[PDB]
UniProtKB/Swiss-Prot annotation, chain A:
Protein's job: Accessory factor for DNA replication. It plays a role in accurately duplicating the genome in vivo.
Per-repeat ranges for WD: 219-259
Subcellular location per the Swiss-Prot or TrEMBL entry: Nucleus
Annotated protein name in UniProt: DNA polymerase alpha-binding protein
Length: 425, 296, 437
């Protein structure tokens, strides 16, 4: 098997002399064939903050990673890397990674404090932002890397386990693993897009930490996978939180298309920053369009049932409340775990979590109302248990009263009394 | 490889127009092909306890799971499911599962508090006993599911290392994994019973928890495998606590019979509840003989 | 897959009638085909301590392990093992290991206090020095075993997990695990179609996994040496979540440097042991990659962090010989920094948990930390030379001794970087503040 140089949201040349090296929420990096050399261009979306620049590549960089403080470049064959800080205050630096026979650099990543290099033999070389080496580690062959601050999300491949992932932190003291080569349930690729899968065998369109620090991956099945409870090894689950193919279908008014595609950039709380690609090819082109936003949706929608109700896609309030309930539940659980362990990063997480818990109960109360409407006392009671706020429990009682369900009211009041008794302890 | 819809102790149609959807210590569920539709029958072994019933299946369910409180039905292609409580006091509910192109429901399971659906793409959708969704999880492709109270025992298939199993609790706190895609020591299948191995490629005749909460599996090699000490990841062993081929041979005085086969229902502490099949086929037909027991 | 009888640094017969059963820092065990029987010879490197002897093998032992107090022999097929103490105090003893249909003994190991037998079905049978059996354990199929005192490093293989390793201690009552079947990131052999006529094909038929040897270091750290000829050491094995496999020696690279930057095809390394910072080995000269008869005198190869690049090495040598491969002091300082950092981290964990064993480790660690700061100060100087105040400060933070911080300040003063000096002095103050809290 042949390992290929990976970079987040990178595109292949195809029939052109240009492609994108890497791409995320910060900006995009492209490279153009200049006779015998290359012309690399580093661009940004926040034009105010950073200044777009370009330089001549005499090495043929095929690996790249972009963050808010700098850009990392890599040559998969010669093993030469270069880190270029965005500001001119900090100097560029260059190293050459030792490569054995047939060994290739497969993926690189960088944070403001760390520089990461992974190879096909499983060499994990790490540095600080200045190029000072920390320790050389031997792991499974690495196929994709991403990082955030001091933490690293790595994807490995072999002939045995197939695809696996590791989650680690490169602290000031030592390297610690949260997860070590656990199964990665991302669907592998199974033609006009053949150029892409020769360029990207795994079909990993991109991978990244969320804005709140949760590992995410976006495969050829165009489904965003988020890792839940990664801090508790026995509770770790991969969650499909967005079927982009479905959203496009819904945006297209229930029509099947073959010319609209999603290119993942990042995940900010509940929104997928991306590029909407219009054309036959699934990867973005020149010039790069303006980034779009796609709110995440739990894969609980059925096309047939959606079509029936329309007779952009309109969603029935009952069905939408169920998805909103699940979505809120997941996001709430995740954000709480974040605050319970790592604290705040942006300054609005507490406010977000509060509104998130609010949306949870509101959507849950809608389902509760429908259950009362259908005289389903049992299902309604189960929904009431899942309520968070005591004010929502109160609201549930009043809804039950309007529905004239006295048997339900007493049992919900039993819940309230029980929680009030826990308050006494 | 072909992902065929699985259910515990389920039998194929064959040349007949009827089969068993699923079958355990509680009862047996049949389906009969009519002019255009199907007729599903839910029968029990303790007639004094549950009321047998039947209905017209307009959807063509090929997935079923049975417990002491209700029956779960599933359609592998349209992704439709239906849960029917045994008691009339509780209402039936129907729900459709999202399915991508070529994605099929491969196995369903239910307890008095949980409803489980697994697909060939590794989607793990869980609900309570009323249909309220709890979480959608992405795992390895699921081929077989079974559950008991809050615990779940799933069998998965990898292109690379074949069959694996997971064990987890879907408690009110969070899904906790005891075992995550560890090796499944079960022996794959090596004819008259060729219809069966097309119906079930993985040869897993049935699977269930014991009365004391241990995952059991019954393979094509007809050996009841028991997972002991799964709470202790270091000491976990699979134990062949019953070779049914030996026990039949001993019942026959010491002669090799080719017209007797064991069909697993459950494991109740000390005995294996089963169905002794008399015929050329390894799977029971109509009528269903009285349940037997095999001392461990 | 077919499991083959493994022994540390064992060689195959190949196209000869003799080979080595096992090989380490203590000595070597060879066997010669004697018509219908075999002639086993046990030799030592410290000729003063032990006396070389030999005996006739009517069983056909293909498994062996050597320690300082005795030698263990094993027959992979019959399951017969024999432990022969070097000294006459304790008698030799023999047992027969129960083997099911097709079950083979795959690896044996022995310390002065423990004897271990591993099978192809994953049976882990252990005994004391007198042959008193412990509890029998069922694990993954074992491919390689090594042990030291009461601790065992075992390598397992399956079709599922692939290659894994376990780290354990054989207490007085029962077996306790430090690590249980975690991933073993050793590169497997890559065999072509031209290799079917290669002279070294016989080795990979004899040793499919390509494990040339495995052992605990002199300080008790697990090491393995695969077909990629790279020494892997397991760091932080006491802390499961911090466990790392570290490549600390590319022997192919060292030979290249020893050959003055010339590519060779006739020099190979055969691993014996790891002593602190030095790899004890046999330098094999010839077409085959394994040693033959007569055996050369053992060589020493100091470990080097794989951070050197051939192209950059050649370039610097042209400017040196214009004025064996010569290494530029700036480039050499980085490797020495990394190497010292690793060795220091390891030895510290060793002393903090197991204490001393030889009696001079604290002196060793002390000099080691000294070498650490000294090499680190060279990088700091170069950083100051390039006016790179940021890079210098990052380097300054990694300094250990406060006296080294002082050294950094004086270097900064000589470089006329007053802003750096103040910031380095802030470190001294900060460390003073953390010590009081």
């Amino acid at each position: 098997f042949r390992y290929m140089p990976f970079s987040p949201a990178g595109t292949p040349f195809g029939f052109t002399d240009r492609r994108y090296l890497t791409m995320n929420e910060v900006g995009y990096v492209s490279t153009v064939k200049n006779s015998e050399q290359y012309s690399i261009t580093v661009s940004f979306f926040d034009v105010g903050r950073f200044r777009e620049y370009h330089f001549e590549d005499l090495f043929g960089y095929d690996l790249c990673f972009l963050n808010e403080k700098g850009t990392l470049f890599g040559q998969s064959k010669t093993g030469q890397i270069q880190y270029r800080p965005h500001d001119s205050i900090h100097s560029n630096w260059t190293k050459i990674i030792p490569l054995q026979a047939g060994e290739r650099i497969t993926s690189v990543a960088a944070t403001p404090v760390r520089v990461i290099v992974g190879t096909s033999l499983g060499y994990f070389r790490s540095f600080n932002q200045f190029g000072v080496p920390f320790a050389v580690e031997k792991t499974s062959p690495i196929v994709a890397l991403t990082a955030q601050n001091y933490r690293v999300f790595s994807v490995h491949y072999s002939q045995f386990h197939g695809l696996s992932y590791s989650l680690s932190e490169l602290g000031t003291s030592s390297k610690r693993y949260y997860k070590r080569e656990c199964p990665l349930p991302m669907s592998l690729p199974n033609d006009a897009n053949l150029d892409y899968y020769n360029f990207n065998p795994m079909g990993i369109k991109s991978l990244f930490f969320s804005s709140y620090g949760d590992p995410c991956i976006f495969g050829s099945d165009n489904t965003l996978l988020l890792l839940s409870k990664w801090r508790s090894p026995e509770e770790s689950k991969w969650l499909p939180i967005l079927d982009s193919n479905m959203e496009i279908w819904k945006m297209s008014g229930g029509k099947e298309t073959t010319d609209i595609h999603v290119w993942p950039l990042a995940l900010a709380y509940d929104t997928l920053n991306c590029i909407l690609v219009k054309g036959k090819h699934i990867w973005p082109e020149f010039p790069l369009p303006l980034p779009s936003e796609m709110e995440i949706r739990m894969p609980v929608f059925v096309k047939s049932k959606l079509l029936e109700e329309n007779k952009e896609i309109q969603i029935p309030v009952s069905m939408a409340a169920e998805e909103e309930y699940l979505r809120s539940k997941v996001l709430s659980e995740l954000l709480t775990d974040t605050l319970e362990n790592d604290g705040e990063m942006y300054g609005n997480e507490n406010e977000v979590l509060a509104a998130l818990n609010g949306a949870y109960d509101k959507a849950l109360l809608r389902l509760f109302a429908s259950a009362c409407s259908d005289q389903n006392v049992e299902k309604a009671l189960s929904l009431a248990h899942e309520l968070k706020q005591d004010r929502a429990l109160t609201a549930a009682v009043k809804i039950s009263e309007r529905a004239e369900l006295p048997s339900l009211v007493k049992k919900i009041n039993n819940i309230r009394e029980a929680r009030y008794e826990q308050q006494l302890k």
